[PDB]
Structure formats: structure tokens, C-alpha cells
Amino acid sequence: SPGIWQLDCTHLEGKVILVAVHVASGYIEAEVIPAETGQETAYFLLKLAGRWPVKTVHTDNGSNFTSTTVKAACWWAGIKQEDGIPYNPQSQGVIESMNKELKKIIGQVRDQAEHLKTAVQMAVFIHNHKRKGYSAGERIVDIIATDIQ
Amino acid sequence: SPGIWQLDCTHLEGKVILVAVHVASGYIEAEVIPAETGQETAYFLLKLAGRWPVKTVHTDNGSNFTSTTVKAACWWAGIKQEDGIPYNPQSQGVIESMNKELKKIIGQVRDQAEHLKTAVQMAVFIHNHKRKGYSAGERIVDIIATDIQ
Numbered sequence: 001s002p003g004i005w006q007l008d009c010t011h012l013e014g015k016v017i018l019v020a021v022h023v024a025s026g027y028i029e030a031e032v033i034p035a036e037t038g039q040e041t042a043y044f045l046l047k048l049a050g051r052w053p054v055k056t057v058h059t060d061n062g063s064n065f066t067s068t069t070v071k072a073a074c075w076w077a078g079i080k081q082e083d084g085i086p087y088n089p090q091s092q093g094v095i096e097s098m099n100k101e102l103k104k105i106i107g108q109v110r111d112q113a114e115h116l117k118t119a120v121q122m123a124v125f126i127h128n129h130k131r132k133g134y135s136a137g138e139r140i141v142d143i144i145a146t147d148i149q
Numbered sequence: 150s151p152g153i154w155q156l157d158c159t160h161l162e163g164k165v166i167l168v169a170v171h172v173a174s175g176y177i178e179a180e181v182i183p184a185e186t187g188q189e190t191a192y193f194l195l196k197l198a199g200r201w202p203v204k205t206v207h208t209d210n211g212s213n214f215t216s217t218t219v220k221a222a223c224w225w226a227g228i229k230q231e232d233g234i235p236y237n238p239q240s241q242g243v244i245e246s247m248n249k250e251l252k253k254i255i256g257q258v259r260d261q262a263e264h265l266k267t268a269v270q271m272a273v274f275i276h277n278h279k280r281k282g283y284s285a286g287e288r289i290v291d292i293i294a295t296d297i298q
């Protein structure tokens with residue numbers, strides 16, 4: 001549970017926003033990339049796993065599941081690479097809702113930056129700090145600290 | 150002190166490696182940039198503060214302390230921007246040691262990637278996971294979780 005992350009790819013302004021969600025907390029990291037490639041996804045996972053104890057990643061699609069560069073990143077970083085099949089149908093809905101929420105926040109901040117990447121990082125900040133009560137940022141730290149102890 | 154970070158700028162291969170250190174744990178985030186501008190520093194702080202509860206940042210030099218773009222990022226993200234004067238002389242030594250350690254790790258991984266940015270992220274991973282026995286990644290989570298509780 002503490003180590004499980006899900007990848008998610010959404011599109012805006014002709015660009016791709018790649019998101020990793022910590023399943024148990026709803027905490028996210030995200031970046032803007034010109035297109036989803038194996039190299040972009042691999043580099044993103046490398047960053048993520050240096051920052052959080054990433055044990056398992058549910059990949060966002062079959063191309064990233066297949067990608068030897070993504071497999072190489074997962075090997076390097078000690079991540080178990082898994083598929084992202086929603087065996088629990090509620091999983092689809094959760095990711096869909098999150099993409100809608102993120103896009104809403106990006107709209108609310110869009111005029112506070114020229115570049116989409118800046119707006120996306122503002123959206124990450126707002127998402128992670130939002131109290132729903134604890135924030136996703138608080139939940140992830142508590143979950144992982146409990147695991148360590 | 151759970152919320153205190155220090156910026157650090159070091160150079161390699163004609164590029165700049167910008168580092169943020171969580172003082173209490175030694176945990177780091179880092180990125181490669183072409184040069185250390187206010188905008189680059191502002192964007193880096195924006196990313197950091199969306200990911201960790203950044204209360205205070207000791208800036209790495211007077212130019213980043215002065216920069217209105219850096220001040221704007223700190224305002225946006227709710228960060229108290231401070232100078233980085235080593236009133237405690239041991240502070241210089243610690244940062245210098247860390248830069249030396251990071252460069253050593255980058256050397257050890259350098260042939261496992263074409264691009265410096267990839268090597269730097271490998272180095273971040275190795276640094277944060279190294280047991281010294283807890284790792285910096287464990288220490289930061291424990292410190293922050295204790296603060297929330």
C-alpha cells in the first residue's frame with residue numbers, strides 16, 4: 001500500500017501532462033512533456049523514485065508497460081512495473097475525476113503564468129495542499145512514516 | 150526545522166546543478182539547468198513546495214535573494230525567503246561536502262546515461278536512499294510526520 005503509485009497521462013494545450021498518483025493518499029507529482037515517449041516516462045519515474053519510496057508502479061497504458069526504456073528505469077530504481085488494468089472499476093472513475101479536478105485548477109491559475117508547465121506545478125501545489133481533515137501531502141507522509149516504524 | 154530548506158548551486162560539464170537540501174534530514178532534490186537565473190530558481194522552488202511542506206528557504210546567493218521572480222515564487226508558495234549566511238561556520242563545510250559527495254556519485258553513474266540530467270537524478274536517488282541506520286528519505290518523512298502529529 002505505502003509503495004504503490006499509478007501513472008496517468010492527460011492532454012492540454014496540445015501538450016501532454018504526465019502524472020503519478022500515490023494511490024493510498026491521492027498525492028501527485030506531474031510534469032509537462034511534448035509527447036509521451038518511453039524515454040520521457042522513464043526519466044519521470046527515475047525522478048519520482050529518487051524522491052519517494054516507489055515500490056510498485058501501475059503503468060498508464062500498454063506502450064509504457066512494453067517500453068524497454070521504461071522497464072530499464074524500473075529495474076534501475078527497484079520498482080515493480082505492473083499493468084494498470086482497472087480490475088476494480090472504481091479506479092477508472094477516480095483517475096478521470098482527478099484529471100477533471102487538475103484541469104479545473106490549471107484553468108483557475110492559467111493567467112498567473114505564461115507557460116503551461118508553471119500552471120501545472122501551481123496545480124500540483126494546490127492539489128497536494130487541499131484539505132478534505134487532512135491534505136494529500138499530509139496523508140502520504142503519515143502513511144510512509146507509519147510503514148517505516 | 151521540519152520546514153527548513155537550503156538552496157545550493159554547483160557546476161559540472163559547463164552546466165549548473167541546482168540543489169535544495171532539507172537541512173534536518175540531508176534529503177535533497179536537484180535539477181540541471183543551463184544557468185542559475187531568477188526564473189529557473191523560482192520554478193524549482195515552486196516544484197519543491199508543491200511536493201514538500203516548505204516553510205523557509207535559505208537562498209544560495211544574493212542574486213537569488215534579491216530576485217523579484219524568486220520573491221514572487223516564495224510569495225505564491227507561502228515560503229519565507231531568507232539569506233544563506235553561514236552564521237554557523239559548519240554550514241559551509243556541510244554544503245561543500247555534499248557537493249563533493251554528489252559529484253562523486255555522478256561520476257560513478259556517469260556512463261549509465263548520455264545526458265547529465267539523467268546522471269544527476271540517479272545521484273539524487275542514491276543520495277536519498279543511502280543508509281548512514283536510516284536514509285535521508287526515511288529521516289525527512291519521520292521528521293515531517295512527527296510535526297503533523
Ligand SMILES: C=CCN(Cc1ccccc1C(=O)NCC1CCCCC1)Cc1ccc2c(c1C(=O)O)OC[C@H](CCC(=O)O)O2
Pocket residue numbers: 111112113114115116117118119186188189190191192195218221222225
Ligand atoms: C518573470 C517570470 C516569467 N513569468 C512571468 C509571468 C508571466 C505571465 C503571467 C504571470 C507571470 C508571473 O510573474 N507570475 C507570478 C509568479 C512567478 C513565479 C512563480 C509563481 C507565479 C512567470 C514564470 C516564472 C518562472 C518560470 C515560468 C514562468 C511563466 O511565465 O510561466 O515559466 C517556466 C519557467 C521554467 C524555468 C525556466 O525556463 O527558467 O519558469
Ligand SMILES: C=CCN(Cc1ccccc1C(=O)NCC1CCCCC1)Cc1ccc2c(c1C(=O)O)OC[C@H](CCC(=O)O)O2
Pocket residue numbers: 037039040041042043046069072073076260261262263264265266267268
Ligand atoms: C534509450 C534511452 C536513452 N538513454 C540510453 C543510454 C545512453 C547511454 C548510456 C546508457 C543508457 C541507458 O540505457 N541507461 C540505462 C537506464 C535508462 C535511463 C533510466 C535509468 C538508466 C537513457 C536515458 C533515458 C531517458 C532519458 C535520458 C537518457 C540518457 O541517455 O540520459 O536522458 C534524459 C531524458 C529526458 C526525458 C526526455 O527528454 O525524453 O530521459
Ligand SMILES: [Cl-]
Pocket residue numbers: 128129137138198199200201202
Ligand atoms: Cl505538501
Ligand SMILES: [Cl-]
Pocket residue numbers: 049050051052053277278286287
Ligand atoms: Cl527515498
